[PDB]
UniProtKB/Swiss-Prot annotation, chain A:
Changing residue 51 to E: Phosphomimetic mutant; reduced translocation to the nucleus following treatment with etoposide. Changing residue 305 to N: Gains susceptibility to mouse-specific RU.521. Changing residue 169 to E: Slightly decreased interaction with nucleosomes. The gene is Cgas. The modification N6-lactoyllysine is found at residue 9. It comes from Mus musculus. Transmembrane segments: none annotated. The N-terminal disordered part (1-146) binds unspecifically dsDNA and expand the binding and moving range of CGAS on dsDNA. The disordered and positively charged residues enhance CGAS-DNA phase separation by increasing the valencies of DNA-binding. The N-terminus is required to sense chromatin and its phosphorylation blocks its activation by chromatin DNA. When the N-terminal part (1-146) is missing the protein bound to dsDNA homodimerizes. The arginine-anchor tightly binds to the canonical H2A acidic-patch residues. The modification Phosphoserine is found at residues 137, 258. Its EC number is 2.7.7.86. This is Cyclic GMP-AMP synthase. Changing residue 72 to E: Impaired tethering to chromatin, leading to constitutive activation in the absence of DNA. It catalyses: GTP + ATP = 2',3'-cGAMP + 2 diphosphate; GTP + ATP = pppGp(2'-5')A + diphosphate; pppGp(2'-5')A = 2',3'-cGAMP + diphosphate. There is a cross-link at residues 117, 181, 210, 237, 240, 247-248, 302 (Glycyl lysine isopeptide (Lys-Gly) (interchain with G-Cter in ubiquitin)).
Length: 343, 348
């Protein structure tokens, strides 16, 4: 029952989130108007996506993706990484960001940021400012004061209606969970490229991950009014909040982010697909088997990207050995001591 | 005696023979579409609604193709509280659409549009002399012009003219599609956001059509997403539909008193049975006899009480007294109970 008490404060109330929704929505609208106006290279920019823009267990933290349809691209995998690609064109206004024969991500992102910095300064109604360029952030972040501090990440992305790259052929292993009809439909949706050398883009499946979170059960009536409740989402909130609180205390956990937890629980939902395996009456058992699974990913240094199997997030090149051991010690400490961090 | 699984073996379609008929039925439909998209034609923007889907469930001979027309500028009006039949008008004075040629006053005439639609198809069916296909005679109950192809295998192709409206579904369907405790509320909302359709047959009335929705439900019939998939458990929902549909088709072949009943009655009764018994375990292949019998008992209960509501329009009773006489229901009930009690001799 202790975990249910922690979830009681982690659930977003619709009243406090609605005042932020009204503020975030209109600011993104005004930014979208300007991108479609005058002589900006981002004329056909549209928003990708309410509760979808909010970060799950992070109140008043928001994500917005500005997609740009580019149907004239030719992808080239960058050094067999599977996730990073160089974009080329077969046979126009995006030539300003072209560097030789490859479209520069840094040139487009820097110009994309100048247009956002000019509009945030032309706004004097709500007091909003642009972050300084973070090292690991392609998005342009906005600090909105409500007076409640609100952060909104504006991610520039390229939309491609073509087929998903070959590196995702064995990705999305939901055949024994969400089924093959769902997998075929999801893979027929477009895929996205966000900047991350300076001219390489990385694949983004935020739209697909959003669908899986809202359609997580093997039964269609899962977590509905006329259906059974499960604790899949509750285990994700507890696991994400545990890692967030651990990053607040120790700077040694900088190499870990929320997407590792999200990736690890997707594999758990694939390994344990049955809705009965995530009964809310067994929340402590479900959260512990998720912890044990995450610790196995840390100690074996194996956490494959759920869409790109060849790409290992916990590889030795990405995260060093001392950080994984450090995180493993802290996770085992709270796992045996009743999780004192939640207090 | 596992006689039901023997009937199903002879009833399943041979993919070798259904693929040959698929190649010829598509290219003929493609040619008809090409002649529709041409200049001087009121059906310029016509399209196909949907290879393997177009063949009927228990009928390998017959195929069904719907030619839809987007009409984002029409207003609907119920025709005497029927729920299913409507008169089609325009929101304002029409200017840019050629469909005003079929106006019978302020109401879009179905017989006017269907006649010109059949004139165009009968022109192209007489132009083609390489495959030998003819347009069937005028049947009263069918708005679709039927194409009879000799492959030499005789195959029927119903070309159904339909209007596509992407607006909200009419209020007669508000309490229809009751799949909340079965396929879920998310599925129901997504289905109700797809367009709805109107088919012809006062000669200006149009009937609602949910063939696109009924097709989704057949291919997504399980409460579990993996139902009838490779990595999932097989159920017998579709097998009971085929047996029940084939039982009525064989009874209609033998008795002319069953002209009032059609396959849609079978299709409607099983959608209710799937709502009444939503669990995939209630449709286990080991219980094929139990599932097919409890379906027959449900269909006999609909004949007895003379109530079979349209699965999408609750107020529309398909077994109403003004639609089917009690003698036809008593006669169908007598014949079904005979087959149910004597091991179904008609299957032989
Ligand atoms: Zn659930
Ligand atoms: Zn099934």
């Amino acid at each position: 029952d202790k975990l249910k008490k922690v979830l009681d404060k982690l659930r977003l109330d619709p009243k406090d989130i609605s005042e932020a929704a009204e503020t975030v929505n209109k600011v993104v609208e005004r930014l979208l108007r300007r991108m479609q106006k005058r002589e900006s290279e981002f004329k056909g920019v549209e928003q990708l996506f309410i509760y979808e823009k909010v970060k799950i267990s992070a109140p008043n933290e928001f994500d917005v993706m500005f997609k740009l349809e580019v149907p004239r691209i030719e992808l080239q995998e960058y050094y067999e990484t599977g996730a990073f690609y160089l974009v080329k064109f077969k046979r126009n206004p995006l030539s300003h960001f072209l560097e030789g024969e490859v479209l520069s991500a840094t040139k487009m992102l820097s110009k994309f940021r100048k247009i956002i910095k000019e509009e945030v300064k032309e706004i004097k109604d709500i007091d909003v400012s642009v972050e300084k360029e973070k090292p690991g952030s392609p998005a342009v972040t906005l600090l909105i004061r409500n007076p409640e501090e609100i952060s909104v990440d504006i991610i520039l992305a390229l939309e491609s209606k073509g087929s998903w790259p070959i590196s995702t052929k064995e990705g999305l292993p939901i055949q024994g969970w969400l089924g093959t009809k769902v997998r075929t439909n999801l893979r027929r949706e477009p895929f996205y490229l966000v900047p991350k050398q300076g001219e390489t883009w990385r694949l983004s499946f935020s739209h697909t991950e959003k669908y899986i979170l809202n359609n997580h059960g093997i039964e269609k009536t899962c977590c509905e009014s006329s259906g059974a409740k499960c604790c899949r989402m509750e285990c994700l909130m507890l696991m994400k909040y545990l890692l967030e609180q651990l990053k607040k205390e120790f700077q040694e956990l900088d190499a870990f982010c929320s997407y590792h937890v999200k990736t690890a629980i997707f594999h758990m939902w694939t390994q344990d697909p049955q809705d009965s395996q995530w009964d809310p009456r067994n929340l402590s058992s479900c959260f512990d088997k998720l912890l044990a699974f995450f610790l196995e990913c840390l100690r074996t240094e194996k956490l494959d990207h759920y869409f790109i199997p060849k790409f290992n997030l916990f590889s030795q090149e990405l995260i060093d050995r001392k950080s994984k051991e450090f995180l493993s010690k802290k996770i085992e400490y709270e796992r045996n001591n009743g999780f004192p961090i939640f207090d």
